[PDB]
């Protein structure tokens, strides 16, 4: 930073070890003060290596003489005297980081926060920030997982993540704080941090247990409130990882989860694309979920969930592994919520398939097909139409419904004319075909 | 084998060769090719009637016959016409400023921007004005602000501005536009602001364009008293430039990097915040920065471990990296003299004193900063 004026390498070499011997147990503070004067002299002489060695020696003397309190105000004075040399203080924090991690003790938490206060004065991205990250991670381990330190590690990561990250160390630090955030069970902030970090991909092509760990912590975050389409998308994003690391149990249970989720997701054009892409997989045939997907994806079958709970509901009781199935539906509280989420999901599916097949269906039959009463069937029918999914008009006094838009006489005669022209074209094609086949058949 | 190996000769002579009969037909095809006149459709008269200005002659109207996709044609689109076929036979997109294109797409093979020392602050200034807005718009979305537009570099004529401009040009080499800000003058009254609008339209076509132009003082000026017709052409060119870069419609993801030598003579209207968001002065190289540049320039030099670099630092002061390859050069043909394979420290001392005595003569080595 600034040019060195007067070096004292000879002075520190001839005196510092002698000072250490004179204060082996640290009972003398005049020795600390005289090295403070010496490092002040070198600081005014703008020497960095001499000051750094003095600070390293001072903390080392405090380590061996185990004066924890006197260390606290000593490092406070050193870091607050005039701010000294940024290289020297960055060094001194580093050996302090190396020392606080070896002695468990009770007041190391006080040591951790003390250095945190010394480094939080600024100068984070510049002059060492990994020490502060390690101290915050060290605090997490000391408190064994809570909400206050999880918030602290939440509000710390952003500066160093944006400034100077590591393709392994930084992302693991992000993974090690979101799990605490999910442990706190905060959802808005955990969603915000997850979506601001997942933009940094294209390293997962060489992941060992990182992309899967990220995903398996954000599975609970999404599915907690309402997510069902993003659930299937990253459950297939953890399905393609056993493709390169073929382990049967995780692979098969991932297949069971993604197949169940992709069907369970609310109907949309994108979900139709995923279910068609998922279907036809060569490696998916050997599981009962293959039969479940083939039945429940297409051909507009009557998805009577009362029948499905025994026809294809065996995954609840016993399957090949039934570990994802028990996680989804075998649970008590969240399982019954997902059971109800299967219960309705097949109701809109049955309404949707009935929309393209039956124009007018009596109220009793539709309620029986939906496995509900008249009022519940009309309530869901109202739920579809307010979403503009289906074109439905009901006479509630009569209990009769219609799905065909009233045909305006303009386009009604247009399709009649198009039907006429199609017939006219068919006459032309048939006439040419029969007359020419007539010509071939009378070549005799 | 004689019937085998004599074959392998004769067909190879051709392949790429004997590729002439069709080249002949193509140029004969050109010989009877109709040349279709070119205009810009000002506006669409009706669904089948389109008002088109010939680039030179009058506005005609033409009409697509059966399948020319009249919907995709827009007021201002480019179509081919014929004074005989009465219609548009095919449609054509736009232009790209060709003269500017090649001189902006012929960036020579440079070295990395890390090969110049002492300007790390300027390097990170370039990163947080170019890379940051496009890589992470989500952070600025949480911020809710627009990224800055441009940055100015000024100082002594020897700083590394050309190296930095060439290094950032070599970083992309595909969407980087270089401007020298002096080919604007031409024989005709036109084609002065027409070109300026054209690569601005090119900057509209490609979002991540980095526009570099040098010597704003070559168009800037302070104020022209008793202006000449050539002076008057600057001020309308400057005004057109100002109203096309700031104006009423702004640019998106387009950043302008400009450099000059006289900051005081620049027009105050351009340098106000909003057009020039940041002003950066590249100062004198530091003594340790000069040491790093000297080591960089003396990399591939046959020398042993006796060179007193500190002596060079003490003697050579106020000397840009320009003067340092001079010293490296001057030690070069000093080594050529007497036919010495290696370079001795005395050659560097001769170079330092000769360059120092060279530099004594010149005064006012740098303009004062604003």
């Amino acid at each position: 930073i600034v040019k060195m004026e007067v070096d004292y390498s000879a002075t520190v070499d001839q005196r510092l070890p002698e000072c250490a011997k004179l204060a082996k147990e640290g009972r003398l503070q005049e020795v600390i003060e005289t090295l403070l004067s010496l490092e002040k002299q070198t600081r005014t002489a703008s020497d960095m290596v001499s000051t750094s060695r003095i600070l390293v020696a001072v903390v080392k003397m405090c380590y061996e003489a185990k004066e924890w309190d006197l260390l606290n105000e000593n490092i406070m004075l050193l870091s607050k005297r005039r701010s000294q040399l940024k290289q020297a203080v960055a060094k001194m924090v580093q050996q302090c980081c190396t020392y606080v991690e070896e002695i468990t003790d009770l007041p190391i938490k006080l040591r951790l926060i003390d250095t945190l206060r010394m480094v939080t004065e600024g100068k984070i991205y510049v002059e060492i920030e990994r020490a502060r990250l390690t101290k915050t991670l060290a605090t997490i381990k000391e408190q064994n997982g809570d909400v206050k330190e999880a918030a602290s590690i939440l509000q710390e990561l952003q500066v160093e993540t944006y400034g100077s990250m590591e393709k392994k160390e930084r992302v693991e630090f992000i993974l090690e704080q979101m799990r605490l955030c999910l442990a706190v069970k905060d959802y808005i902030r955990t969603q915000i941090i997850s979506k601001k970090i997942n933009t940094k991909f294209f390293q997962e092509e060489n992941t060992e247990k990182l992309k899967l760990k990220y995903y398996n912590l954000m599975i609970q975050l999404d599915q907690h409130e309402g997510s069902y389409l993003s659930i299937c998308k990253h459950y297939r994003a953890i399905y393609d990882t056993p493709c390169i690391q073929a382990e049967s149990e995780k692979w098969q249970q991932a297949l069971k989860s993604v197949v169940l989720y992709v069907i369970l997701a609310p109907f949309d054009n994108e979900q139709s694309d995923l279910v068609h892409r998922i279907s036809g997989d060569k490696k998916l045939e050997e599981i009962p979920k293959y039969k479940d997907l083939l039945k429940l994806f297409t051909t507009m079958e009557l998805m009577r969930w009362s029948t499905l709970v025994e026809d294809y509901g065996m995954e609840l009781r016993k399957g090949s592994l039934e570990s994802p199935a028990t996680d989804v539906f075998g649970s008590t509280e969240e399982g019954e919520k997902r059971w109800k989420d299967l219960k309705n999901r097949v109701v809109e599916h049955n309404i949707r398939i009935m929309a393209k097949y039956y124009t007018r269906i009596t109220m009793k039959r539709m309620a029986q097909l939906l496995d509900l009463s008249v009022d519940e069937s009309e309530a869901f029918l109202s739920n579809l139409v307010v979403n503009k999914t289906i074109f439905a008009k009901v006479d509630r006094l009569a209990g009769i419904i219609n799905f065909q838009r009233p045909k305006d006489p303009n386009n009604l005669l247009n399709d009649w004319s198009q039907k006429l022209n199609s017939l006219m074209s068919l006459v032309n094609k048939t006439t040419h075909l029969i007359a020419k086949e007539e010509m071939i058949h009378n070549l005799q | 084998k004689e019937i085998d190996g004599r074959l392998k000769e004769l067909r190879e002579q051709l392949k790429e060769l004997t590729k002439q009969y069709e080249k002949s037909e193509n140029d004969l095809k050109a010989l009877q090719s109709v040349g279709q006149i070119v205009g810009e459709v000002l506006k669409q008269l009706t669904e089948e009637k389109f008002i088109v200005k010939a680039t030179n002659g009058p506005r005609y109207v033409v009409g697509c016959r059966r399948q020319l996709d009249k919907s995709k044609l827009k007021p201002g689109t480019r179509v081919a016409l014929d004074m005989t076929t009465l219609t548009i036979m095919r449609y054509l997109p736009r232009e790209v400023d060709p003269l500017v294109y090649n001189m902006s797409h012929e960036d020579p093979g440079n070295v990395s921007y890390s090969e110049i020392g002492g300007l790390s602050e300027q390097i990170r200034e370039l990163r947080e004005v170019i890379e940051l807005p496009l890589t992470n718009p989500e952070l600025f979305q949480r911020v809710g602000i627009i990224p800055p537009k441009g940055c100015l570099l000024y100082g002594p004529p020897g700083t590394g501005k050309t190296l930095l401009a060439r290094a950032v040009a070599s970083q992309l080499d595909c969407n980087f536009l270089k401007v020298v800000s002096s080919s604007i003058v031409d024989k005709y009254i036109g084609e002065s602001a027409r070109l300026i609008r054209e690569m601005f339209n090119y900057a509209r076509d490609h979002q991540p364009c980095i526009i570099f132009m040098d010597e704003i003082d070559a168009i800037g000026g302070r104020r022209f008293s008793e202006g000449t017709s050539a002076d008057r052409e600057i001020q309308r060119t400057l005004m057109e430039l100002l109203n096309q870069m700031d104006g009423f419609d702004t640019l998106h993801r387009v950043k302008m990097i400009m450099a000059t030598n006289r900051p005081d003579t620049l027009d105050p209207a351009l340098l106000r915040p909003g057009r020039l968001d940041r002003k950066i002065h590249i100062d004198l190289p530091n003594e340790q920065a000069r040491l790093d540049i000297l080591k960089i320039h003396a990399g591939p030099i046959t020398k042993h471990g006796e060179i007193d670099y500190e002596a060079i630092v003490k003697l050579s002061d106020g000397f840009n990296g320009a003067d340092l390859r001079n010293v490296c050069t001057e030690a070069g043909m000093f080594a050529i003299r007497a036919d010495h394979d290696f370079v001795v420290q005395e050659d560097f001392m001769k170079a330092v004193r000769k360059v120092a005595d060279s530099k004594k003569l010149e005064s006012k080595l740098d303009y004062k900063p604003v």
């Binding site: - | 036109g190 017709s229 008057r232 001020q235 309308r236 005004m239 057109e240 109203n243």
Partner: protein
């Protein structure tokens, strides 16, 4: 004062057509149709009695009187 905030207003204070014209754009190769466009814009103005014509950037380009014709 903006010098156009009264033209963007007023045209809405009393409902009236507003045209930017732009003098700098007008001086171009379309000098032959320059008379025609003035006729066209005047006809547009005459078509809607509630209208105002607003022309900009006259000083620098549009018929400066002290500098000789170039």
């Amino acid at each position: 004062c903006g010098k156009t905030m009264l033209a963007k207003a007023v045209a809405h204070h009393t409902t009236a057509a507003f045209i930017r014209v732009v003098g700098s754009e007008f001086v171009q190769k379309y000098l032959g149709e320059g008379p025609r466009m003035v006729r066209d814009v005047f006809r547009l103005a005459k078509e809607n009695a509630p209208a105002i014509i607003f022309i900009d950037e006259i000083d620098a380009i549009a018929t400066k009187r002290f500098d000789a014709q170039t």
